[PDB]
Design a protein around this ligand. Structure first.
Ligand SMILES: Cc1ncc(COP(=O)(O)O)c(C=O)c1O
Ligand SMILES: Cc1ncc(COP(=O)(O)O)c(C=O)c1O
Ligand SMILES: [K+]
Lengths: 476, 479
């Protein structure tokens, strides 16, 4: 007999990706902490300006983040040396979880290796323990949420993106007593659209569902303190109360939107300048995940210095709203320039500047020309990250992308569009349009963008954050 | 389930009642005072004996120097995914070093070995729906989860029972795709798989092999490449960094070469965090291109990768790390043997101390840390079967005989204080897990007397300061 042809199967599957042009070539990009947002390629002499990083507030290089790392390394070394149950539970872990709980004004928070792992662990456990659970999932949810929902192994319904009429009809089709989960994101990063979190909470109350909210692309960027779009929903109540829970919401009600969301997940690998993921929720939910989630239990704890760096970034960004107003103003500068030039930015009320291409091969060629000819780094985005035919260049301005740098980007993208004769806004219109190329108004209003750090409650500057019992287990 | 809080309360209460509810210990390991750590207060110091920082490299000067220098240049976070802004020189060097260590065409780094195991196993079953997985009953939770996620037929074979494995493989045509998934070193009792015979079975019955060396990398083989390397110890030592022309028996391929997929962690011997798979470049490109747990997550911080790279390079050419760990482990095992302290026999670096009761194991651990300033965690269900609860002791090159003497006397005292069973007491009841079993022959140590006499001067010079070229497959293969 002869064995199965494993290599033949692998070859055929990779060949298909080459054929449809989704096969990926990674770019060697070495970001320079001393020259943000510059990076160098294979050689240090070849520098480029990074315009697609998710280090949204430039805090990966902030002096307070690096100092926290250096000091923690001197004391703790590199690896944690164990798991949370065995030798891997320590003060940096306790401080990080407490800061995250404080940021979202939740009873607790639990740190995982990544938000991918956190989403998978949370969603997996919910379905494994509630086999009658019905999950209602936004069609554009991130791969980590799709995977977690699959692992949950429960009935699921996918509702069209941000379509709350369909969502309600799906929720209506069950008795209220059936356990339900609504899983969605605050900011969907590839096109930058935003969920109506308050209406989803209203639907969850009415039809008896828990809410699972992924704020990976909003933490650090929305709300007065960077706690996410959920915080932005009661912007003035949270700004007035600062670190404290407000007595009423922006509409005069009892509970803020962020308070009403049952589970909020975030990453430490973007705005917070590090690596890792977390869920913030009631202490009972946190203890539940801590006690039952194998992706939490059976893996090495993140290095102490990595946690300390994220902690420093969280604390700094909490009391620096100028990071957020600065990012938004730079994004608006780029968006306005591209609109005047007919550069097809997918309209969104967020910090993302995705430029529609619509062809995987043309997107790669545009990215290659940008980096090789113009020393501008924007990676081409293709399937599976985005649907085939919606390939795009995702530009992410930060507080470090000042107008002088933006002008260089703008001229470079304009030039690449001319060199490759790529479709402009008017050309997408001629074909019927795609992905919006009614625009939602910016999440950050003119009034909010005029706020300074002097407009924050003094209690968010250097707060003393007590460690949480639930991080170690609750004694009865 | 409309009452969610009641369900959560009920399930948490069950864990409290069965006493599987965990209380974590605040332990802050001191890079300058290894293996000491401090508790909540810096003045409250203990000696850590249960860390998986197996070679003490989490504090090695070359590891910390690599972190500090990389931080100043790169900052903290990678700032993206491998596809978007998160692909860099530290990543390329780490993957190339890992491929070189296992003498494989490529290696792919993940957030953790949990993630790597889940990703590889998940993809194998997703893309081969006819796959049949054969899994050792003692496989780690990450492998159990990955195999479940693979969503294919599976057979669990009795631990290290290769007669049963063969009977299971024989029950299928050779043409059916198969995966044999196992570990080299099982951490809870320290037993070792017969990797060569499993490879022989895989060839005969047409199976891929998936081997988790998490508890072997850094510790076995002349260069720390794992038990697979130890299987051809002299061929690898002679060739150093290069692939040997023949194996220790004069055959064509070494055991490590024959294993299709090898996974490891960066979070134990290599003193950092992360995981990887080492395999052919086609398999690596396959995982790189299709595994969502690889694609859709932030790349590990450059300094974390650089630290792991420094540890890998240092440990490769310092076999005295391995001879030192083994001699310290043997020192502890011998002393416990003379005192009747019941160590589960095993030919590895682990010193599991048999207790036999979950509450008594926890109590022994509590007394050790609070009364004796010795930190050893109690291992209970589900990690081990009820009635097999144990204290897991893991000596390292940093646990000198002076520290071992304190440990030995402390455990002896705790056994007396709690009236815990000695070897002879287990002997009276029929023995358990090789402790006090009549006619039980202990597997001989993987590290032989001859191997333990080797020094760093006995390694090929080409493993000191090798120039390791970056791999094309880490970035994608242009055709
Ligand atoms: C055998 C085995 N495989 C995989 C893992 C997971 O390793 P990591 O901590 O890198 O996720 C562990 C760690 O406990 C393990 O013991
Ligand atoms: C919406 C969303 N959720 C979760 C994740 C996973 O985040 P992490 O990098 O921490 O694994 C991502 C990262 O790309 C994401 O975009
Ligand atoms: K040979």
């Amino acid at each position: 007999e002869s064995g199965f042809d494993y290599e033949g199967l692998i070859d055929s599957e990779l060949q298909k990706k080459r054929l449809d042009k989704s096969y990926r070539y990674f770019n060697n990009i070495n970001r320079l902490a001393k020259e943000f947002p510059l990076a160098h390629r294979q050689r240090e002499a070849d520098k480029v300006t990074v315009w697609c990083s998710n280090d949204y507030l430039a805090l990966s290089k902030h002096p307070e983040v690096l100092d926290a790392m250096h000091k923690t390394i001197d004391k703790y070394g590199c690896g944690a040396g164990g798991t949370r149950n065995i030798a891997g539970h320590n003060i940096p872990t306790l401080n990080l979880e407490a800061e995250l709980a404080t940021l979202h004004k939740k009873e607790g928070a639990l740190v995982f290796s990544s938000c991918y792992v956190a989403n998978d662990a949370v969603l997996s456990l919910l379905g494994q323990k509630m086999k009658d659970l019905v999950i209602f999932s936004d069609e554009l949810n991130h791969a980590s949420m799709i995977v977690g929902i699959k692992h949950a192994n429960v009935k699921k319904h996918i509702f069209k993106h941000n379509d709350l009429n369909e969502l309600e009809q799906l929720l209506q089709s069950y008795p209220k007593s059936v356990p339900k989960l609504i899983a969605f994101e605050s900011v969907y990063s590839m096109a930058g659209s935003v969920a109506d979190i308050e209406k989803i909470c209203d639907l969850a109350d009415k039809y008896g569902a828990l809410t699972f909210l992924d704020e990976v692309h909003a933490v650090g960027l929305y709300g007065p303190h960077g706690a996410g779009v959920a915080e932005h929903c009661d912007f003035e109540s949270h700004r007035a109360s600062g670190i404290a829970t407000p007595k009423t919401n922006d509409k005069g009600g009892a509970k803020t939107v962020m308070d009403r969301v049952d589970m909020i997940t975030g990453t430490l690998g973007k705005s917070f300048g590090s690596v890792g993921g977390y869920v913030a929720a009631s202490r009972k939910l946190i203890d539940w995940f801590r006690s039952f989630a194998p992706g939490f239990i059976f893996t090495t704890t993140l290095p102490p210095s990595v946690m300390a760096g994220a902690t420093a970034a969280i604390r700094y960004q909490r009391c620096h709203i100028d990071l957020r107003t600065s990012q938004q103003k730079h994004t608006m500068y780029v968006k306005k320039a591209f609109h005047e030039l007919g550069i097809p930015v997918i309209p969104n009320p967020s910090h993302i500047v995705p430029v529609l291409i619509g062809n995987a091969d043309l997107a790669k060629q545009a990215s290659d020309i940008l980096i090789n000819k113009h020393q501008i780094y924007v990676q081409a985005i293709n399937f599976p990250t985005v649907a085939r035919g919606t390939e795009r260049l995702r530009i992410t301005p930060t507080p470090g992308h000042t107008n002088d740098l933006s002008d260089i980007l703008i001229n470079a993208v304009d030039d690449v569009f001319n060199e490759l004769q790529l479709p402009r806004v008017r050309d997408w219109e001629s074909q019927g349009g795609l992905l919006g190329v009614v625009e939602e108004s910016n999440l950050w209003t003119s009034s909010q963008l005029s706020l300074t750090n002097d407009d924050l409650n003094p209690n968010v500057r250097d707060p003393i954050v007590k460690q949480l019992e639930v991080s170690s287990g609750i004694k009865q």
